[PDB]
Amino acid sequence: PPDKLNFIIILIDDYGWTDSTCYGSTFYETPNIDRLAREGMRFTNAYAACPVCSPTRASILTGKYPAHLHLTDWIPGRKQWPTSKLLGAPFYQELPLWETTIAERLKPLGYTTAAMGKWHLGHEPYYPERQGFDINVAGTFRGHPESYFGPFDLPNFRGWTKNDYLTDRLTDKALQFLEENRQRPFFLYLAHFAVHTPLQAKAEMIAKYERKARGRKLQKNPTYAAMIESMDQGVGRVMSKLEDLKIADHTVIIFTSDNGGLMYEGSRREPVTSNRPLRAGKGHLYEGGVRVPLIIRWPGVVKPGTTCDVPACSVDFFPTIEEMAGLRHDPKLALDGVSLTPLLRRKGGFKPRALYWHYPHYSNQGGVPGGAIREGNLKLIEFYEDSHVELYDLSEDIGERHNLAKEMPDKAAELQAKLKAWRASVRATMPTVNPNYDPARADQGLTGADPA
Ligand SMILES: [Ca+2]
Ligand SMILES: [Ca+2]
């Protein structure tokens, strides 16, 4: 007969567009992720459907936009500033069980399914076992690890010692799943806790990067760089286990991020990484917070070493996988993604389209309520506090410094209206004018509030 495809999604947490060597970094050292890029297709215009953790994770699994899911902030969300211009919108504190995940869709084709690492889509019963997965390892309502060192006390991930590194032990448990299901068709959602705060790593590895951090100016944080090395080791271990088991040939790998790099977590004087050239990072609707790494190895279909400039989003993985597994798109599902198989096959037929964002919240990283649309090369951001819009040309201004909104006031009007129409198509919940808005004491004093 043929060879049913396996699927691994490797999802690094808060991993920036430029936090890998094959994406421009000179600090961070990511040799395995590089080998994956050389073995596959690297996407220059890949996006996360939301600039914070929970909703992007909900996007990936459902093929639906966060605004459409009504899960639009990280759970449970920034505390309300008592005096801001806006009251945050309410949202589901869980990925609802009535949403279909890619795991549920594969199950009936004989797939074994596991979610391992960061869940952050609600308390149990909204955990993975009740959402298409056979195995949960380390998933909870939590959006971060208490520590990167043992002992541990998480679901099916219980106990090591103060000398055991999380990223290392999580990887062993994922290898365990590969070893167990070596002969079966499987889907693995591998969501590292890396590289979310708190910054902790092996001392010897930190030392390496302090020696390199001298007069670096930009990407400067040794602990973080070490987190990335320990993460990159975990990725090689997966890649090379697939070799030892003689199934790399028919296993699809998708390597990406749930949002852009952290840089100025709420009133902290130091940034964690930098996304230059891109403006800002995690918690913002600027490209820093939404443009992410995306590498796809599909041995024998994706010509290795290729790249793709076409904009892709978290919503596209559901239908991509569905089609990779020989499934008819269910017309009752009403997803927001399209399949990337035409791009991966370097064939044509990939219809040109718009991407949408909707973040009716204040973020912990300086972000403010807004939405955005990207059509071809132009990108409009709408700021919900005062309805003002910014428009950038990302072919000429990837760093979003020159605002064209005054210069091209009709493309601005066109895109704002296209975005408003989408907001309606999905009944995006909007924020509200705060009755206790007091401009005097409305500054929340988060160091991320752009200037760039
Ligand atoms: Ca995240
Ligand atoms: Ca379900």
Numbering used by the authors: 6 to 457
Give passages from the manuscript:
Carrageenans are sulfated polysaccharides found in the cell wall of certain red algae and consist of a backbone of galactose (G) residues linked together by alternating α-1,3 and β-1,4 glycosidic bonds. Sulfatases, which remove sulfate esters, modify the functional properties of carrageenan as well as its susceptibility to various GH enzyme types. They are classified into 4 families based on sequence homology, structure and mechanism (SulfAtlas), where the S1 formyl-glycine dependent sulfatase family include most of known sulfatases. In our study, we characterized a κ-carrageenan sulfatase, AMOR_S1_16A, belonging to the sulfatase S1_16 subfamily, which selectively desulfates the nonreducing end galactoses of κ-carrageenan oligomers in an exomode.
Here, we describe the identification, production and functional – and structural characterization of a thermostable carrageenan sulfatase identified from a metagenomic data set collected from the Arctic Mid-Ocean Ridges (AMOR). Named AMOR_S1_16A, this enzyme exhibits an exoacting mechanism, removing the sulfate ester at position 4 of the nonreducing end of κ-carrageenan oligomers. AMOR_S1_16A represents the first identified and structurally solved κ-carrageenan sulfatase from the S1_16 subfamily. With only a limited number of available structures, it introduces an important novel functionality to the diverse and complex enzyme repertoire for carrageenan processing, while enhancing our understanding of the substrate specificity and characteristics of the S1_16 subfamily.
